[model samples]
Target: LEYSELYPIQNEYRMMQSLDGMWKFQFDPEEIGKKSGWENGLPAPVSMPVPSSFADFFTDHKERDYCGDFWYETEFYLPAEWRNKKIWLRFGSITHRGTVYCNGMEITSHEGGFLPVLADISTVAKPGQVNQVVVKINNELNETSLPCGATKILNNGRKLAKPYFDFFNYSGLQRSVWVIALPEESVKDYSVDYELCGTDALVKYEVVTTGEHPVIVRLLDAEGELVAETEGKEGILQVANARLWEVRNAYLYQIVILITDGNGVLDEYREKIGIRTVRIEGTKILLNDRPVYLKGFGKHEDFPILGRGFHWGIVKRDFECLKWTNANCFRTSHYPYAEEWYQFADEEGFLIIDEVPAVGMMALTVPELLKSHIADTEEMITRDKNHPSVIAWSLFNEPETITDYAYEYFKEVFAAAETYDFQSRPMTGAFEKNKCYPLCDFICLNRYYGWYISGGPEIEEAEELFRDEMDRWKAKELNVPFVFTEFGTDTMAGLHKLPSIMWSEEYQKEYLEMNFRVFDSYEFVQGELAWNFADFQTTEGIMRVDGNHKGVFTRDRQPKAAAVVFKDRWE
Candidate 1:
């Protein structure tokens, strides 16, 4: 299915009402909320904030690790003047599974959790009256889910969510929800891709509509001067002496789409567009015709209280840290992040390796799971196709392909991604021991030589093992580029040792230096993104203190000794 628009437009003609405060919440472990008609409004629900994870806030240990259905209720009303306009209840995201209701009536349901879900509530909503909105979210995991795992029912009859992936399964309404009002025949969707010729740019665009109306498209430079104009549903316009969008020095153009009839204009929509091109040739990834090396970390959308939720304060601080490290690019790691992150990446000139929530696809024989995998891939590419910062797409991370069925399943996934992506960005996946590496455009390996295979003083042996694998891959004659999507060790911050021991700051830096030496020796290796940007929460285990300590910075975003080494090398 087609995905909804990534970002909401807020101009003079449109209206947006945020539903981002505390809401009534209740956990339904017995799954009887529907039978009890809880969609109308809970009986004795407690208060819980929206746009935040429910896992960390619960006092009960079992509720904190809940793996069943839960419900959220909030009330909203539209202005009487908005009766004639189209109304939509848009959710930034709801984890795993979600079912939305308006006034006790089911409106829509979505499967994947990382992308937006838009419900058209124009016909059901009663204008000028209080309308109840209910959301039913399920955090259960199974073989059919993208980040596949299982849930168990113990003798005590409590549910436990065990994720195959390393990260904690913190679920809820992890992003924002909005009530948007739009003109009946406004711009529904649009996309733009550019071709650079010397200093000029040829921009090709397409605008999808809700109704038949005359479309007018205009492009303006940073100075608000008109650069190009066209009147069509889809066409190409060339701008003379266009300033190119460069790395760390981004230049954006304003795109305005106006829908009109012979009488007057009906609606206007605007978006920021960065004119650039990305391509791969031989063994190098080119951005705007320049060979650029990606130096950054495979990051996660994690923090202390937010728990994968969106917070502007944390966003600003993260960007500041990235700038201090002198890094230019990063992968979304295992899943797509909030839409605001892509906007920030566009503005701050950071290259992104956009990814789907398709982690831990190992040793499965279920046909239904394969179908869900393909569907999730389509949603990911559709939502992120228009962003200039997204240079590549990653399909799966560290999947197991030990059998022939595994190869066929992933082949279908790669084919679906190519069909879904409009810009045709280069596709890749993180593979450690998978045989499906030949299906990708480039090789993205998540190898842990010193940490997982050998450790401490044996890091020299780890370097040789890494080199041997690279040689085998090179001898395959695939003629594709390579990137280390994940490579790092867990180091406790401030832990010191004379001779560098495991989990020490000295060993962490030394391990990275050895990997860098091997990477520099191979000309085809184009990028290296360390395992993680900061320490993040994970499932409880004896190996973890509070969570994983593999990050260069702590969970609160404080720099360790390794951060200084990264700044010196990356700069």
Candidate 2:
């Protein structure tokens, strides 16, 4: 079945029904939900919120750390007015993998939980009647998964998935669910890129549809005045006096595409796009042909109750905090975030280093792992290629590169990303090892000089080591811009010392100051992204008080003393 693009129409022209509320939920530890006919409905279901992580809410510790299959069933009615139209069952995300069924019929199964999964159900859905949608989500991790891990059997015969990454394995339908009604012959997908020539801009576009139709595309200025129009399946439109999208000063144009047939306009799609170009020239990152300095943090989509789930209130607060810190860029550190976040970044003019969930890719010789890694890179790039805020595509983060085979694995991953990405933004991967440095377009180094290597008074020696390594990389003459993708010390909130000590707020501020000194000394050092924006949940460990305390802000979004130092330096 053909599924439409998951892009939402901001205007009220398209019909959509949000399936984002309570649902019947049940756990299937034995993985026998399908055999037990749970797709029709859970046998002994309990009420649970649709777009939430089931891990945190459940009181039982076993269920909270569940690593097996679970079932979620929701009943929604098709609108009576949309009988002949195409209907799509869209899920924002299903952690890890999921198998979805509608009215006891298996519809589709999707891997990689970060991207949206769309299943066309026009032939199966009965309009004006109740439809049952059941999803079986699994959170098991293995060597082949993007964020790879392993399953460990305890002495008590209980099994647990031990994550290679630091964060907790919070899983479920972490985003929204929706049923969209669209014209049968609608726009399936589209891609847009711009070429800046002096003041005039050439906007290139490609529109894909389910069936042959005459496509009309219009570009409107901020005032809603049409500036350019074209009629074709794919073409280029020229715009005069183009307002280039600048950092912290974004100017967007509204793009409206319509499909027309003999009966008239069949479908319409709208998106706001910024006319911008991001490129890496020698040792500088350019935005719209101008050099850009990125000053931000490597952030995670984490919160108290939501865990890795989506929450608008938290999103708004995080952006507000970023604006306060005078930061203009952020890396989606370990995974691709919700699409709404990219839209917000585009509107607010924040640069993004979009990354896939290819963390902990250590087993380079595992063919299954490498295959899944390449597939994830392609999926991440294809889904996020059109976003103006995405300046670069990070292929992986902190992958093991000790063996020669690791380079070959990442070479394939990088090549896959380039093949899938239409805009062809700069490609990069955060590296602690030197082997994969040659594969990336730019150098993204994740270092911990003060915290992980040395601390407190020994930070002086850590600075020497940090500078020595940078000089070594410089001697290689990669001639690429460098960004500190991760650097910070763990500091618990409210922990203070008069003279400053490790894990104290004063020590964290001083630690950042030393790192800044090294960053400013190098002309090719183009960006500095702190280790984290806020404290986040992680797998329980002796080192973590509650979770990772490297955040400048507390878990509740309250700033520690280091935030003042960050603002002073960054602003």
Candidate 3:
């Protein structure tokens, strides 16, 4: 219930090693792998990279669209010294559902894809030897899954995903997998609450350790000076002078937590802390107690063959794109991204709307579905709450509240998010047409006026219909800050038309210009994050030529013509 600790990093007291690379993978087209004993070992296994989507690497179309169960097997060497240490197999993510096994024995089963699956592998792992780790993963989606969808059997007996959402279901490990070792009784987790007291800063902290040892916490400044220290597991430490993290200007301190007993130091973990606070005004959002407007994109963790796979170079390149775009914020959009994204945002002083994977909830919720959703929602807050960059939470995207069941479902989700987020950042959803907008702390409207509705070269017609909805958004008078989290058209980078049709760079630039007019006119409007940062892979359809062309930049991270327009205005 208390969710796992923060992502592991190699330290003096903790050992984290990457278990990422080609793993033995095979598609269970009949979904009989578990029944056929594939968890122990796969038959006719093909090589596939861990932390990369299995979908894109296949040359055959059917193989690229392969659905249902798959298996990944790899081995990790456990040092004999770790016999006394607690060992964990940590997955950055396993798309959809996964059951982890060691050698052949089941260790843990997990639901949900976006959050990490941490399994205690001490019991099954043989120390000082190679332990075969097998993961039985399923990419099947349904009304029950977050980012909801349903799978049906094709005429050829293939499982086909009919997603309620739009994005392509690029499934696999798709993230870093690590084998970590820690002291048997060690520091587990800690949370810090920051307060600005004029020139000084007050940090209220609570430390949770495995064995209840006398905990020691210390805060170090950028220059490595010990700024504050405390003797207990929970206490406040004050600093004489503290620099606040501002937009595009970041200042960080290192927090070192230690667990000590008669046996000397048992464990030590260090976390980079950027002290900052977030708040919501009637018509504004404030960061570090100052008014701040969000400007960025509804971003996705996507790339070429990697799909949603994460690599350090990709993270670096994306941030550089954000920097070049003169953007200060981004919503994780449909799902929470890799942890490194938040770390980079903390370092760069960029705001983030940390969303759960509850996208495209077009149907009424069932009891089981709600429980699974709550689990993911709670985990996201726990994992991301410590980051100074996460200014708010997005509970769902374009969910249906028409059913009475949905109202109660959303209430539980929202209430749980409010209960778990210690920082109490604002809550929002990328809503298109939901009666549940009133339940949110702020509003993020995903309107597609000129693009999807009343769209085309008839630009003024798009304006009229757009303002028509805007007038009612004002008439409702919720008074909450409005952030247009999604807007913009699918535009090809070089495609041009003298008359500016859809899917042309000229149209996307002008479409944003019009949407900005509506946002600028509304007093409660606080932000405008374009529908996408870059063109991305989506479910193949006639509408998506190859994939969505809605990005201000192309899929390779190049600037489209619209980027020039956005830069000129944003800068």
Candidate 4:
């Protein structure tokens, strides 16, 4: 895990550029790219856009279904003046695994692809000249990798990938890649702790930097006026009559962290943060000591063509839809999202239950996958720990807790997470098992009782099965809040069935009604998050009609009938 890593920023002492255009791309099914010295260059590379998926650009299914090693290459010019500055190459993400090279010299490699990969390339890079950067990456999966799957060879020697989850295994350079320059000594990390006392806020601030230099921390108002200033690397600052960030209403004050010696600025990192506190108080989630009922969808970083690639347009539209539905929170379904997303949530006043891509943990290899599971968890917490938008950390999704050793495996995961997060946000996992209730700060359930268990056709039977499960949880008198993380029927956008069958818009509306009714009956149920915000692609199978249709909106972002009911109920 890249612990205490800071998100790259542009400021007076730094400059950066996003490397997001067409790059040389090719696939190496035979794994000969390294032996053939393709890192220096490619043999027959075609132009492919960075910050996008390679699967969607291929018209042939075989090419789109490729599951082996692929390659990407690009070049950037480093100004001669930059030789005095430390140059870094930061990748927002590269699918399952990646090994990077600069000027044909191996530089860095990383696994578990949702977090940032930062490398100092100042040694290998040439100033005043163009330098080459090549990445050899793979999308193959196994029980150990996230969104666990197994790989099989085909008749043509190509590979087949099968994901345990119900989503597509779309992969590539799925987020922004940047070339950043900074000073020799820079502000490495900073954190804020809030004490919401009467009419005033106590902020305990800390800064970690590369060198032992004089540190300055400043709190500035929204209008750029300084409210408080302290000179130690660690100290407390008070803001009287502070504006606290609340659900659906956000107010942020900029905290500027700088290192200087009374001559000039050595390094600086500025973050706009809000003051808020979260705690679980016996069947309630308290934000600033007031009970908040969560309302939102369990969302994915997915869209057409982009194929899990980070696109600002998709993000903006999705947040608008959430606002339209009067939603206040969303769980980062299946994986941690791009850094820009948390920033938006900070500004827009939305709560996030940050999660790792530890899906398909129900496979028999929880012990085997424990290493990466903890790695992903700490990495995600390190990346998103400072944001006020994130209220909780979801450790996994529906892992099999029935095994003999499952309890101990989760015990270690939870302990590592507890040690890693500085804020100590209450930890929980999306589960279908009521047995694992005692392991988390609170429980989050991903039930399909109405859709996949007792199922639709007879929605009544589904409701009965759902109630039986909740009844079991209630009997325990756990005195902890239960959040329904997922529940929905796959609904096609325009489909209508008179008496309503599955996959019809009419059936989805009815399904929501039954779910809401069941939720209302349980006093311990404190939150409701629908399965998905919109339709998304998945692995090709008989069970999937093209892709998953369980969206409140269509894949193209059009509202389905389910959206109307949710709007009515939540608003």
Candidate 5:
């Protein structure tokens, strides 16, 4: 099926063919087995969907806690006409970790579960012959991997530890699969990197390409005129534009990249690149030459039916959510999000704290798991560093310690942070004490003094608690910009209150007023992100049917009373 024809123009509402309809699947309980007996495996070769978890496929496996190896096999033939083109196989995503083989030839091996990976199979395919593709996925938790924190010890005498978050461990290839035919010597890839010389002004543009053919790069103004153009440069192509991109008002620019080899256009890609300056003065964050407060929220990539397969339409709807609330910044909670989401953030002019997926501090205390944490951090930064909207690298999230090998590992992580992302600021995990506070560029705290874990303190007590927290840092003369990264109570949308449903509008409104009254009174608070943008899924037994309901919006994206109150305060 032609996938491109079904995709939306804004790339929203895509109806592409899925290779996951029915496939031969088998689960190997013992390690002493090869995947050749799928025709007579234990669970039987039943019809199953591709890009889905094994737990969803079998009821028995779901009944029992699932952990082991699974092998899947399927067959398909390439079109006769596609024989002459270079074929590339793409897997949407694999859960935890897995590897793949095509016709007994190992094509790819990936460590991360959320990102996509592609392998070229031009030499392995026959033009019109039926080809068999096999994929063996192993979602085992080893101490060396981040998110595996203290979960399992590796055979090499190392232990894998995971973060202290309330969430279920869903395992398997939880995404789709497909193959594409690209023209030989086609547009290999392209990248954009910007340097702000004067804090959101006097910006420099760097565009680079990696193909054997000559490329043409163009920079367009917001009015659609060619402001700057460059041709045939192998290295960095730099250009300084007069007006750079700033946050919100007058934030302008158009970056359109085209690759042609003197035979019309081969492929073209366009991005809205803003030229704006950003810098940190002592402990304050300055964007576009102004001390703009970052009243924003942390978001998770999930919805009712889509899981993590986020569409641009939903992204637009979420951006509308941010705009209506007058939010100027966002943090991709815990892990990195889709690359296209960063593109959307740039176009909408949102300052983003693009974090690496290194929630491994708990496991970092174990010396054996140190390399895995470092590797995870390195991979996360290298993959997402190109996005301009990402202003800071969150090294870890809510780590409880700052000593021993783990602390030393973080210093190395900070060094790696500087190497991977030169443009962004470096900040460690949230809400650590004085011993760990000095390790980061900014003191990002997550004080829940009056919420959840503690018997709710009064509004005056909450404000005083916030003040006391900041005063500790100030007395130590640790001058750095700080933000109350998470501080908000739960709220229920649609429903009013009858002394039931603490998340209800009436209860939420009252709850928010108390928290805001405390937060707004503090001057050391440079920014305050209200816990979450919307209610998200979590294994924690919170107000959500199965997730956290701390968001101003419900899981279906409806706003609660706290949202209105927040908008009024922020505006």
Candidate 6:
């Protein structure tokens, strides 16, 4: 979803301001130990992009891989027009951890990297004067949390599970920052309850004015007719014979939330709600009513030129590419993406696997991995449960060692997901190694069959091996289906001879052909996603220096030769 789609009120209400440029920045090395004094600390003048990570701004720094403490400050005069209006500061996202302060007063502190945090700052606003906003960013690369869910640690103590993959983990404020003004005692946050009745029927409505006055709920059908109307303190508004949002037939309902005080409109919000039902019977994932397969690639929020910055145009291009390729699903690999992307997926008719930004952890084995997994899962699910496109909750990626504790940990993760989103969708822990399989709803494996692990096996050999593995799971009557979540070779785009480059064109063509051959052979095999959708940035062994080129598109977003081959075979 583009920003325009997500924030419909921007046009209809024109009350929000774009806070997207020129912020003062100071990067402190871990050795600096939080030094003070930025000459213009309160109202500093540093022109940094609001939709970009600090790394993009400071390219001349000697420490490219530095990860510790950094401070950013920006100043803007509070619109004198917003005197009586309640002001809200919103951070679309921050990396790892951060604290926000407005005009010397602490507004809020957030730890996770992927959740949106909004603070009401009406009282702190000095009307008609400069309102200083300072954000202290701490992108600590540690092991206690799941950094990127692989065992091998990076230079800064962070590790991406698929170290041999193409992608860079550029950490900073990689999203957008905005300021919104509203009336006091209006709807603070919006919530929706989705209940699926059957293939072509479901119920959904928003719970608006959550902590304030009662809201008048209105549900509009596709033709913009008032299909249902009700007023209450709080309850589920059911919609009968609702059109199900499918891949080709993406139907959406408009939920309008109007807050009225005595006799006037306090505030109004309209959001497009995609009404759909998902069911996983054994191994097949049913969307709406038909069994859908995942013909897609993994996406990492990395670009050599843009880093983790929010570039809506580029994101739109990526979506267009996905549609052109005839793929229907996207795994927000390594972390959760900006919330607007989910809205786009909904409107564009794409299935999504939104992951949490909790891939870094202390251990790759069982007992040690439990606490970290729980902490990461809590942080991930609590924030991401609202999206409709997210069908499965993936706890952690491949951790080489597994034990009884790991099994129980997965069981607990599933239990948490069931409570969090109880529509009977599967909760998965992606893996390439063996553990107890009876505890999971679906079995997933991430194998670099002819790439990282070995190079001699033909695609046929890999398929035979996969069949044998699935046969073993079936023999045990596992009941759940098996999926090849991650399987692809990391071939350099355009055959550029980077030292870390792996497969040649001949090797890549054979690799992709073999993948299709094996994937098409099995009805039991739900789907297969190649290692990556595009080239990204990373600081691993596979990365030549700071970028991964294992994608079908170059780091600069150019389509590669093998992309044509893959698309033809995939279609």
What lDDT does model 2 reach?
Answer: 0.84
Compared with the true structure, all predictions reach lDDT values of: 0.84, 0.84, 0.84, 0.85, 0.60, 0.63
lDDT of 3 by residue, 1-571 (tens): 4225578978767888789988999888877888888878888899999899899998899888888988999977887877877888999889989999987989898888888888888788788898889899998888666878989898889998778777899888988999888888777767888889888888888888778779889999988899999978899888778887788899988888888988788888888888887788777787778888889998888898889999889888888989888999999978889898999999998999888888534445588788888998988888888888888999876444357767788889999998887666798876665277867888888888887788886678878887888888889888889888888899987899977888888888888888888888878888888889998998889898878888888888999998888788889
Model 4 lDDT per residue over 240-318, tens place: 8988988889988889988997697898888888888889999999999899988998888788888888888988999
> Could you give candidate 5's per-residue lDDT for residues 1-571 as a string of tens digits?
1111111111111112235556776665554335453322324545556645555334463222345566777777766766766666666566666666666677777666665556567788666776666666666555556555335545753323233454444455555576666555444434455555542323233334435666677777778877677775333334444475556543556655566777766545565666665676776787755776788887876666444554566688898988898888888776666666777777777878866556423335456556655655655565555455766767765456545655676777777667655355555567664455666777677655556534233545655665676567667666667776776666656667565345566766665676666666645557777777888765434344657777888777878778888788878
Q: What is the lDDT of candidate 4?
A: 0.85
At residue 350, give the lDDT of candidate 6.
78
Worst 10 residues of 5 by lDDT: 1-10
**Candidate 4 at residue 181, lDDT?**
84
Task: Give the Å error, residue 200, model 1.
Answer: 0.7
Q: Between which residue pairs do clashes occur in model 4? A: 168-538
Total backbone collisions, model 6: 17
Query: Of the candidates numbered 1 and 5, which has the greater TM-score value?
Result: 1
Return the TM-score for candidate 1, rounded to 2 decimals: 0.97
Q: Which stretches of candidate 4 lie over 4 Å from their true place?
A: 1-4, 360-368, 401-404, 433-435
Whole-structure CA lDDT of model 5: 0.60
294-352, model 1: which lDDT tens digit per residue? 88888888999878888877778888888898888889867888888887888899899
Question: Deviation in angstroms for 515 in model 6?
Answer: 2.4
The residue ranges of model 2 lying beyond 4 angstroms of the native Cα positions read 1-5, 10-13, 155-157, 360-365, 398-404, 433-435
